[PDB]
Amino acid sequence: NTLQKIINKPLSDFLTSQVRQNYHRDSEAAINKQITLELYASYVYLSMSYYFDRDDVALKNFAKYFLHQSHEEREHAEKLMKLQNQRGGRIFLQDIQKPDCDDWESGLNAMECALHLEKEVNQELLNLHKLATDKNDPHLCDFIETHYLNEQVKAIKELGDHVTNLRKMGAPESGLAEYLFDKHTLG
Amino acid sequence: NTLQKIINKPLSDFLKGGTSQVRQNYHRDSEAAINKQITLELYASYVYLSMSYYFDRDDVALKNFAKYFLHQSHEEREHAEKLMKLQNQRGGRIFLQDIQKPDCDDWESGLNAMECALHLEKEVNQELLNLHKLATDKNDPHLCDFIETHYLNEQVKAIKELGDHVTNLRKMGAPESGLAEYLFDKHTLG
Amino acid sequence: NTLQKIINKPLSDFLKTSQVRQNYHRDSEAAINKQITLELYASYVYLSMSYYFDRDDVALKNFAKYFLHQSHEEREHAEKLMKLQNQRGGRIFLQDIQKPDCDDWESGLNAMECALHLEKEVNQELLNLHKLATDKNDPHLCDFIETHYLNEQVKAIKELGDHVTNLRKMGAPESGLAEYLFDKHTLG
Amino acid sequence: NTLQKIINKPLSDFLKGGTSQVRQNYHRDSEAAINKQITLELYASYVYLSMSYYFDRDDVALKNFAKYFLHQSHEEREHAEKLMKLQNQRGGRIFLQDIQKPDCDDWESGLNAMECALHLEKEVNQELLNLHKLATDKNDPHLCDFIETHYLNEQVKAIKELGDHVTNLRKMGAPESGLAEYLFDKHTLG
Amino acid sequence: NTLQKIINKPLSDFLKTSQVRQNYHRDSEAAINKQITLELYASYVYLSMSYYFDRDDVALKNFAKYFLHQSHEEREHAEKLMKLQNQRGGRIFLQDIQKPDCDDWESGLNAMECALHLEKEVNQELLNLHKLATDKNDPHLCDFIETHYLNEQVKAIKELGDHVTNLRKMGAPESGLAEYLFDKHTLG
Amino acid sequence: NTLQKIINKPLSDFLKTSQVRQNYHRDSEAAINKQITLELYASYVYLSMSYYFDRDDVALKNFAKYFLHQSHEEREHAEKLMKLQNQRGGRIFLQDIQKPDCDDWESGLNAMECALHLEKEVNQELLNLHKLATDKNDPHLCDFIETHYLNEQVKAIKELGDHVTNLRKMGAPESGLAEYLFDKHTLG
């Protein structure tokens, strides 16, 4: 899992200003690591979106839904870069690795992969909050809380709801199920 | 059922002790039965509240089933508040009691929840009819007309709608077809 | 005190795996179920308080309106905790809602004083809930309590203290004129 | 600096003596530190007020520098009023003290004033972070969240903006170029 | 009395050539700096007064609003004197703003009485400032004090005297009902 | 130049029949996937430029806005190319987006010059892509390039050249006043 590979790199791989105060180098590095995760997640959703744009898949609202998710992730990354400059840290950009799948199989499978991805990103934001708590950085703790933590919980709950419905309607075997879910839930 | 335990409790247990300047032709039994009816409406409110957030679960995820029962829970609380208003209007004294928890935490499906709601509404309707019989026997025409205009047709309408909902879900294959409950959630409750 | 009895009940009485569950301890899950019954109980107290002032021998309509509003706010508090429980993957476990401690709230001052004490007892449980979430390293739960309960609780306590003060300075418990004018000028 | 004398004064000197019906989980140290923070915000208000009318002088005459610092002076007074509101909300007692005069009557230029404002905001931010550490140690989550939502990001935003202002003025030749301060006054602060 | 101490400070403590300066004596310049600290001090007293009535054990919201407004008016008075100082070519010389004399203002009546006395003490200094400007043959300074301070001071004194009278006739210091009704009907 | 390494990569590395595919050569499908990578890379470069000027030691807000908008336009270009790939029956093959060459652009002039070079390099690959479509007799792909990229590329290059000229005339990278005034008057 290339996502798990990014999560396992040390903080030193993601590395004085007049504005800097109470901003630990570990926090600065973790913010740069979080930028990479958000940019990667944006790439995964962009890939998912145009998979459903294929003539042999052709689920238009699945495509719209994941495209909007991709733009939300890109917006998260840009707000993290803004925070980095606000605190006096320096942005250190890395390669955005390609997603692990070219073919996402089905609408149910794509929602299951999105649920897994959001829970893995949530764990990193939780570890990022723990690091900011250990470094006594309450401004960074507040930033993570206000902008991410409840947004991840809602995204995870919404993806779980979508997974549950698709499985109860007929799993990926019923192409009728994915079509009707595309119209009635994502429409 | 916890409902039956409330229904079969002696009337005098719904009185504060076990005269208002406004009290007139308001029998102690009627005052007691109004307090009993408040407990039933509050209980029914709790049942629909439990039902509502069952469908809000990530492993059930029927948003309109959840919205529908939450609205019903609020209507029941409103019926109870109006009965408390009536109790004070006639000079009775409100005597509250524990609101017992519902019998289930896990309703099985949209069909089963509709069916349990149908049974609950008929049980509450029966107690409302007994309350009317008591008001007739005590020659309380104001109480009789109060029950008629505010509860009797509303219970009949609720009972008819729940039956329609049960019927439609059964015809689409509700217990087994998750597609049936999904499309009913969209087309009828949405 | 029924409320003290609920507060002293152990966490295990508020219990008995989800695809959305993450970093959600069983203790936090039980404590959310505990807080749900506290808010439901508080809603019941205010409901009782409200219709006491609707009595023909009390007849303070704005006291009644004030407490009925607080009753609906506590119910909304409870419903948002049930929504949170499902958001995090816990299982809602409902208990009996005990009847309020009083049937007769005596006066407007006395009802305000009981409301102040009730809101302070609920605040303590919220602070204990926040402490448990901090120990369990649940920042989302910590933030949820912070944004939705702590400042609202502090504002509720300050408003009730203000009300109790004005009523006492007006001569409330003896002076029925004081409670009438307070009902008109502050709650009206 | 007069600021450092306030910061290093013992906590108990910011208490009235040296229980409210609403007081709950509000430690004496927190009550003292809120009174200390009020003195700092009032001091910062005085500093920006002195800065503002320096640029209003006929021999300085930078109208937008004057408007900018006067607005900052009003924001600081507003922070102090809100802390007095919080003190009463939690049952503490407001204890005021002398607002010491600023250290300068003659700020040297627009750049120097921006730089002194940058230093003052970082000094106040540091005391706000110490106040948060104290509220954490006393397990006061309401106070922690109050400081977070109302001061911490606002201080970071103020600190970033002042740094931008200092940077731009230095790049245009601010200390020596009066043209630089004139055009910055027009294009950035106007 | 901190205010008496400021008033008794000599003019030389409020000092230490401009192209705009004309007919502006160093005495007038020092007296403007003195008046600035008086208005700043008065703003501090009213601020203290305001949040005394915001206390949960006082809880008179319109008293608090009234005094907070007066605090901002005194601050605006001070800022206009700083603008005048620069208009005439003087140099602003800021001093410490002393803390108010009281922490506890006792009651609404007592706060109004202290406000009346404060406004009368500031009025005296304004009249002394106008007298100095007349002796120095500074008609612009005389006119500035006339249009911006004298009638506003007289109106402030008359309004506070009215307030003190109504509170006393209502039974203010003993009767908490009086101060509550005055807060609602006159300040509300 | 990381850009050149992408440009010099063979077409076979950009490849991993549909009912809609018609007259769509495998080389064109691969070259579309290559152009997607180029537009995504350019988006990354402009995003890096944008937040360079957002730094507190650079602090040119309109430079930052100008490049952020350019970064969104490049990403919009990439999304329309993926739409084209699916329209013609090709299969999107995504690759790593390489990090930009510089973390630290030196100034507004240097960033503008680097943008000028980048757009010219992307224009050359679009012209090669048009040449490939011409040789494979793909008039639909030729027209797609003509209408959506060629004139937009020419307009971007002329604008960037205009900006570079003005910045150099005004005082080059040495005048910080020049970059500030250009930021206000041209990019504002």
Q: In B, which residues are within 8 Å of C96 by CB distance?
A: 98-101
- Asked whether the beta carbons of F15 and F33 are under 8 A apart, the reply is yes
Q: Are C34 and C94 in contact (CB under 8 A)?
A: no
The closest CB to that of C19, out of A133, A145, A160, belongs to: A160
Burial F114-141, CB ≥16 within 10 A → b, else e: bbbebbebbbebbeebbebbeebebeeb
Chains contacting F (3 or more CB pairs within 8 Å): A, D
Q: Which residues contact E76 (CB under 8 A, 6 or more apart)?
A: none
Q: Which residues of chain C neighbour A118 with C-beta distances below 8 Å?
A: none
Six token digits for residue C83: 């929504």
A158 in a labelled binding site: no
Is E57 in contact with C165 (Cβ distance < 8 A)? yes
Query: Which residues does B contribute to its contact with A (CB < 8 Å)?
Result: 58-61, 63, 178-179, 181-183, 186
Chain D positions touching chain E (beta carbons under 8 Å): 16, 20-22, 46, 49-50, 53-54, 56-59, 70, 77, 81, 84-85, 87-88, 91, 93-102, 105
Mutual angle of helices B63-89 and C61-88, in 10-degree steps: 160
Rg, C-alpha atoms of chain D = 18
Q: How many helices (H) and strands (E) does chain C have?
A: 7, 0
Of B53, B94, B100, which is closest to C51 when you measure between CB atoms? B94
Residues in C closer than 8 angstroms to B50, CB to CB, are: 92, 94
Q: Which residues contact C146 (CB under 8 A, 6 or more apart)?
A: C130, D141, D142, D144, D145
Find tokens 């250990």 and name the residue. A134
Question: Rounded CA gap, F53 and F57, in Å?
Answer: 8
> Is E159 annotated as a binding-site member?
no
Cα E87 to Cα E22: distance, rounded to the nearest angstrom? 10
Under 8 Å between Cβ of D38 and D94: yes
Distance from CA of F56 to the nearest CA of D (A): 5
Q: How far apart are CA F71 and CA A78, in angstroms?
A: 11
Tokens of E48: 């203290």
- Closest C-alpha among F18, F16, F11 to residue F32: F11
Query: Nearest 5°: phi and psi at E97?
Result: -95, 110
**E179 touches E172 (CB < 8 A):** yes
Min Cα–Cα distance to chain C from A126, Å: 8
Q: Do E96 and D97 touch (CB under 8 A)?
A: no
> Could C51 and B21 be called an inter-chain contact, meaning their C-beta atoms sit closer than 8 Å?
no
Residue A120 burial by CB count (10 A; 0-12/13-18/19+): exposed, middle or buried? middle
Residues 6+ apart with CB under 8 A from D52: D65, D66, D67, D68, D69, D70, D72, D73
- Say yes or no for a CB contact (<8 Å) between A157 and C20: yes
Nearest CA in chain F to D188: F184
Q: Report residue B184 as tokens.
A: 């009913």
**Helix runs in chain B, H state only:** 2-7, 28-55, 63-89, 110-137, 141-147, 153-171, 178-187
Please say whether the beta carbons of A166 and A185 come within 8 A.
no
Mutate to test the interface with C, among D20, D23, D24 (most CBs of C within 10 A): D24
Among candidates F56, F61, F180 on the partner chain, residue whose Cβ is nearest the Cβ of D171: F180
Q: Which of A165, A170, A180 sits opposite B61 (nearest CB)?
A: A165
Give the span between the Cα atoms of B118 and B162, in whole angstroms: 6
Q: Which of C162, C170, C185 sits opposite E56 (nearest CB)?
A: C162
Between helix C176-185 and helix C151-170 the angle, nearest 10°, is 140
- Which residues of C carry a binding-site annotation for Fe cation? 39, 74, 77, 119, 153
- CB within 8 Å: B179 and A184: no
Cβ-based interface (< 8 Å): residues of A facing D: 17-19, 21-22, 85-87, 136, 138-139, 141-143
Q: Which two tokens stand for residue D29?
A: 């140290």
Q: Which residues of B touch C (CB under 8 A)?
A: 16, 20-22, 46, 49-50, 53-54, 56-59, 70, 77, 81, 84-85, 87-88, 91, 93-102, 105
Report how far residue A112's alpha carbon sits from residue A166's, in angstroms, rounded to the nearest whole number.
10
Which method was it determined by?
X-ray
> Which member of D160, D164, D172 has the closest CB to residue F176?
D172
Whether there are 3 or more C-beta pairs closer than 8 Å between F and A is: yes
Binding-site residue numbers of C are 39, 74, 77, 119, 153
The residue of chain D nearest to residue E95, with distances taken between CA atoms, is D101
> C61-88 and B28-55 helices cross at what angle (nearest 10)?
30
Residue A33 in tokens: 């690591």
Q: What resolution in angstrom units was achieved for this structure?
A: 2.3
3-state secondary structure of C97: strand
Instruction: Give F92's contacts in chain A (Cβ within 8 Å).
Output: 47, 50-51, 102
Which region, left, alpha or beta, applies to residue F65 given φ > 0 means left and ψ of -120 to 50 means alpha? alpha
Q: Are E57 and E105 in contact (CB under 8 A)?
A: no
Which positions in chain C have a beta carbon within 8 angstroms of at least one beta carbon in chain B? 18-20, 44, 47-48, 51-52, 54-57, 68, 75, 79, 82-83, 85-86, 89, 91-100, 103
Q: What is the CA radius of gyration of chain C?
A: 18
For E172, left (φ over 0), alpha (ψ -120 to 50), or beta? Answer: alpha
Query: Three-state SS across chain F?
Result: CHHHHHHCCCHHHHCCCCCCCCCCCHHHHHHHHHHHHHHHHHHHHHHHHHHHHCCCCCCCHHHHHHHHHHHHHHHHHHHHHHHHHHHCCCCCCCCCECCCCCCCCCCHHHHHHHHHHHHHHHHHHHHHHHHHHHHCCCHHHHHHHHHHHHHHHHHHHHHHHHHHHHHHHHCCCCCHHHHHHHHHHCCC
CB spacing of B60 vs A165 below 8 angstroms: no
Q: Which chains touch A (3 or more CB pairs under 8 A)?
A: B, C, D, F
